[PDB]
Amino acid sequence: TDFLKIELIGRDGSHWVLSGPGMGQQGVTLNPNLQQFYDAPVKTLYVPGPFGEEYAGKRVQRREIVFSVQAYDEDPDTWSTVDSLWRWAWDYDEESELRVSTSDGTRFLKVRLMEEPKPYYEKDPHITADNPIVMTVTATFPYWQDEPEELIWTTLSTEDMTRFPVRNDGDVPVWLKWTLTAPGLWILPDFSWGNDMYSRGREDLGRTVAMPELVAGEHVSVDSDPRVQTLIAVNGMPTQNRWKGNDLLYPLMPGKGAEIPVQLKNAPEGGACKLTRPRWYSRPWSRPGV
Amino acid sequence: TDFLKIELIGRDGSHWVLSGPGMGQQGVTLNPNLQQFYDAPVKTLYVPGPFGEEYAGKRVQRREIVFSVQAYDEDPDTWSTVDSLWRWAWDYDEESELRVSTSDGTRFLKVRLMEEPKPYYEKDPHITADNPIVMTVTATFPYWQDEPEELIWTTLSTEDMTRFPVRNDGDVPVWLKWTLTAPGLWILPDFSWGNDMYSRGREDLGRTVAMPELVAGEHVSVDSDPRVQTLIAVNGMPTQNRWKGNDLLYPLMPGKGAEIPVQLKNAPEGGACKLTRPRWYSRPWSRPGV
Amino acid sequence: TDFYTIKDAQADLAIAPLNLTVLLAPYSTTPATTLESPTDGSLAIPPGYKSVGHFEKQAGLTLGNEFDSKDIEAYGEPEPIRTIINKRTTTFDFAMYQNQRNVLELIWTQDFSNIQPSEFGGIVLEAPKVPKNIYYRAILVGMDDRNDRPIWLYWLMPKVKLDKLDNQTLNDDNVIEYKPTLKAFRDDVVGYSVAQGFAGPGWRDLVATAGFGEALTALTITPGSPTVTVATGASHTAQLLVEGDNGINYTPDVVFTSSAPDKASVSAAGLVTGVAAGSATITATKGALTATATVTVTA
Amino acid sequence: QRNVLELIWTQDFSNIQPSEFGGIVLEAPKVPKNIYYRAILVGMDDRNDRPIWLYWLMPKVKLDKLDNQTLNDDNVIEYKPTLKAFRDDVVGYSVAQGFA
Amino acid sequence: PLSTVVSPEDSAVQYKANFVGQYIGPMWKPMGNGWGSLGIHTHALISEAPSMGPNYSLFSSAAARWLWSMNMDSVTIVVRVLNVGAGKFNVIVCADYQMQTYLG
Amino acid sequence: PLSTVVSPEDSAVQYKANFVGQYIGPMWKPMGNGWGSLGIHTHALISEAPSMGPNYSLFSSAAARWLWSMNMDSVTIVVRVLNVGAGKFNVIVCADYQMQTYLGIQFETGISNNKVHVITGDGPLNWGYQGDAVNNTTANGDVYTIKYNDLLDTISCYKGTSLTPLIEASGLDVPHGEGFRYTGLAWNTALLSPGVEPTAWEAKDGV
Amino acid sequence: MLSTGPIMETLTLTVGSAFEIPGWKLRGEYPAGTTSHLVFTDAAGGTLGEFEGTVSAKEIHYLQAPDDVKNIPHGANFQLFVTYPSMQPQCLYFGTAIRKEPRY
Amino acid sequence: MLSTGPIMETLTLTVGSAFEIPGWKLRGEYPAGTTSHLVFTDAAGGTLGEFE
Amino acid sequence: MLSTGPIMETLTLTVGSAFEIPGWKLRGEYPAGTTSHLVFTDAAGGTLGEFEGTVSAKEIHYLQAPDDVKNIPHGANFQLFVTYPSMQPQCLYFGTAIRKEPRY
């Protein structure tokens, strides 16, 4: 329909319209009954208790999307070209993008071939030149993503402070990324947003943590997401090694936002800071949350 | 169809056309619904991660092709002859060739009987003289192959150097084989082609490995394939013993190719080098990709 | 434009198989590519095809077409976007009366060529121990004769096999009929399972109306300067060919006339015979169209 | 006629060239061909010399099925196809009904 | 795709080395004399920057190979050097993996 | 969602060509005279490497453009050439996608015109001259380095190993930046025989 | 789809065989002065071959000797353009060129 | 759906081909003086094309 | 399909039997001056055989000798060209040769 568009951008950069306006122009359409596509799979944990089982937590799981496409053309040679291009648009080692566009915007999911595709009918595919390919793809990162919101603050002063407006309009917590120039001692916020995961939700309401004093040329990226080491220096220096066992602990919880303060000291040149707030969602489309 | 031609060369050299032009001329045709025939079965590994499970690599699996054939003739005696010939065309110990020829050329798979065939209907087959045989064959090497490309460089000089043009047009990495005459000191390329499988993808871009000095009559086969030993002396000498923990480590990655340098020194009577490059594909047919 | 002009219906394009016959040949017989004789366009049955004789009038002859179809469903569309015809099965059935050798061979799926009649002509046709899968070549040709210009419309099935045989009831007032159904298979040598064709002078009239090729608008003739001999010999007669702009020979359709019969006498078929030396004009006309040729005659 | 026969046989007979005497042979395709047409079903009701043209527009029709045809020495040969309408993307509908 | 993309092999390279940090760094691989044959000398007596050389606690000769290779045959090297005493200093280009053959 | 769209930080790029195979290849887009206006001349009489030029069987003046574009304004072109006759050979820098406006260095070989010029292009095959001309004799296997320096807005040509500019020019009115980073070659001869033509070509971003 | 595009198609090349596109496969309505050309391309954007078709009143014909199409490999891209008089060129058929021949 | 809204539609572009939208696709009644314009922008909103 | 392409096909060969392609299957309009050319080659490309058919007004007929076709093994590639007068050869059929004979 015109209310929903589905696209694939392969590992080679090819563009495919599986559903929506302009679907099938490249020869491949999407068949019904696609699974683990909308809601991010989550399993809940329970521990024995006096009244049965008590809530113990939640864990998000990777997506196992099994969907069928239909590759078609009038003549078998061109159908074979279309099928070869569709196969080339996929890989096991590298992921390809799957974009869903609605009135809520465009959100993408990075998927890779979980196993070998299952192509064609029982007879040879050149009879019909119109054959289904069953694809079992997987999403290691199960959340749907929008392009992250980025802000930049530059200062020529030796000591300065700024405030970044930040707000999670999605339904899942997001982990902030910082890019800080060097030299300079930075103090970054790690606000709890009332998150009681460490039983410190109210104690860490205004938590701030100081990065180690950066030497010249040691511009750092500070990624709070757990898939990645927190501190990484551009010149390869071991900044987190210098940083004495500290860490950024809290994500930006859904529905929370504030003007988080960033402090810069001991920066003779004057430095720059960049804040990247990811936009993760659990469904391809959803009305904004408040 | 004329867009696809499937043939079998038995272990005894018999030629059968199971599908395509000329099918059934030898009395055996191919039935529909043949499985694990097109895409090489690959399984992906996943380890636990922060957001479910994280991709950990892929492993290719051996092919288990289950298909069926019709052995047919008008008279039961000749049907019995044809059925016996079809059974003779197969074995467990030694492999038979299965060629698929399309507009993308001819690619073959070496297959062997995984278990005993399941022939005939519920009644005795001499009634119909037209009976199905269920074949469960297996491909230990799951990749569809073409004829390997062979290059020869012979020289009479004591010291010489050449450039072998090499290119991987397939979708999977291939392992090169060298046949070097003796005596003489050979230096062979082991370029990584950007492969980080040893965390030296660009450090080993122009890596060359010097084989041990060869005495007279010590002609060597240097196969980078992990299945076989790298250095094999034709006379049984332990040439690998004098090689000091060095090895050919890198395959020819897909889409990569150059003029790889081969050097020969200290060769009183010249020397000959033969380079064999396999042509492995994951599909019976596919358009060229780059 | 008015409704009649928009409809542009032609009744002459309705062909009624007033007569019809079925010819069966053994599978070794060379298949019939066409039923039109290359010489004069008459009906030419290839050797090896034998007719089955009469068949029941009321039952007629039924040509059954069966489609196996598969609907393709789209995720973003409620209705099926496409449908695929996997196969088209063609069969035909009729109720034939005669008790001849080929009819009985077809009915019993046996070869009765080795059946030798007894001393007094009696025969016995035993059914095979196991039914035999035998293929034949079928020609179903029917004639619609209008205004003495027949249209032969025919079906060529290079490979047919007995699919089923209807139950036969013996009634003391009706002759015994055999009602087989024959399924057509695709022949690899000729590349089709069933073909439909038309021929005859009536079809030659109706080709342009039906829309195959191009409409007849120019009536060309064989080279217009033929030399003929008065004396009897090889060159005492010359044949003229009348063709249309669409590559169709219209010699039987046109009318041959000679303005000077003394020089070259023209026959109906288009043969000019030299009678007296000089020059003659030969005219072949068809409706408004005409062709002319100046024939030279030498003693 | 040619369009009727093309619809019946799911083949394009534009390249069929009549023989020297006008005879033609129409072979059924190796595999049935999925061909789409555009259909106008227009009817006229003549009332007081003021006709009403009521019509159906099907921008995309395909031969869905073909019934068995019986040859009888007293009836002409008729081809009775069933045509299924699909939704055309360019016009946005599968079937329309109009009056004029 | 090949029009838009630029392959890593088809790209000019630019490498620098300062030795001002008084450590060898991970970009130099010792050759010939084996691991640990290189060193940094301060030259603090004169107003000069630290320089790379052999590990004179163990060896009097040494060689180092820049970890990564160039992408084209033509090459430019710029060395700012110090003549502390007597010795021979080779700048090596067009070398193989093990620095067996080169110009210098 | 993007705050700003910024052009990607394209790195320095390098290219080579030697004209050893049979035909020219798709990496050289012909211009001016259309497709099939380029060819390879073996020059086996003088025992030298094959060179690239016009196909003199049906053409006299021909231009070629490198398929890819430089990623930076400054550029270095190293060309090894042969002088097997009389003619003009143009090394083309900062051209557009159609070689309409470009800087270039012209090597003219002839009885009285053994010279080098700085040229500004008006179409692929038509050009005008800037500044004077420097006397220069070109022998087989001569290597010339044409550097366009963006910071100084200068075009210079050096011969062989010496670093002194054999020819130089500055301040010429040719647009730069994106869409004007294409390099190429051109050949113009009065006769139908090869003149001065390249056997080796290298391009590199920056100077 | 507000704007129409080309049709994806395939071309067949064979060694020793003349490359021909029959006019009945490119039937149309072409006024006098209508041109048509066909361009082959590799994956980098370089032209492997440019040909001009014979545009008649109601068809376009292509016919090339095998020498011309020898160098176009299997898997190359092709575009077919028709330029009506006083109008910009438009692409009718784009697609790929397969080589249907015995492989060696 | 009380208010008039646009229809999500796609456009097709080809290199070396004239971009064209046929008149029969953009139908409807347009009085004299009506002006239509097509605007192409990038991911950041910067205008990269405008046509009448 | 825009261009004219060869049809994949197989040729049967028998030891001690005369090779023959019946004319009723190679049908088509052949003007005077037409010729046919059947080429048999191996995996490398070496020409195993060249044969000329006897064309007629509507058929092409092939008839060789067992001595002529003895040297061609199973799996050898073949291609059948037809050359109309004042025209380049066009590959009607290509494919492979199988042997229908008692294997030895």
CSV table of C-alpha atoms in Angstrom, one decimal, chain B residues 36-41 61-65 109 111 114 137-144 281-284:
chain,number,residue,atom,x,y,z
B,36,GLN,CA,20.3,-28.8,-1.4
B,37,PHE,CA,21.2,-28.4,-5.1
B,38,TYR,CA,21.6,-24.7,-5.7
B,39,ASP,CA,23.0,-22.8,-2.7
B,40,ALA,CA,25.9,-24.2,-0.7
B,41,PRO,CA,24.7,-24.9,2.9
B,61,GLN,CA,28.5,-27.6,5.4
B,62,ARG,CA,28.7,-30.6,3.1
B,63,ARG,CA,25.9,-30.9,0.6
B,64,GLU,CA,23.2,-33.6,1.1
B,65,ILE,CA,21.4,-33.7,-2.3
B,109,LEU,CA,29.9,-31.0,-8.4
B,111,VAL,CA,29.0,-36.3,-5.5
B,114,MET,CA,25.5,-41.1,0.9
B,137,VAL,CA,24.1,-38.3,-2.7
B,138,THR,CA,26.6,-36.1,-0.8
B,139,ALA,CA,29.1,-33.5,-1.9
B,140,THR,CA,32.1,-33.5,0.5
B,141,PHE,CA,33.3,-30.3,-1.3
B,142,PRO,CA,30.1,-28.3,-1.3
B,143,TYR,CA,31.2,-25.7,-3.9
B,144,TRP,CA,30.3,-26.0,-7.6
B,281,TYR,CA,31.1,-21.2,-6.9
B,282,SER,CA,28.3,-21.6,-4.4
B,283,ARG,CA,25.6,-22.0,-7.1
B,284,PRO,CA,25.2,-24.0,-10.3
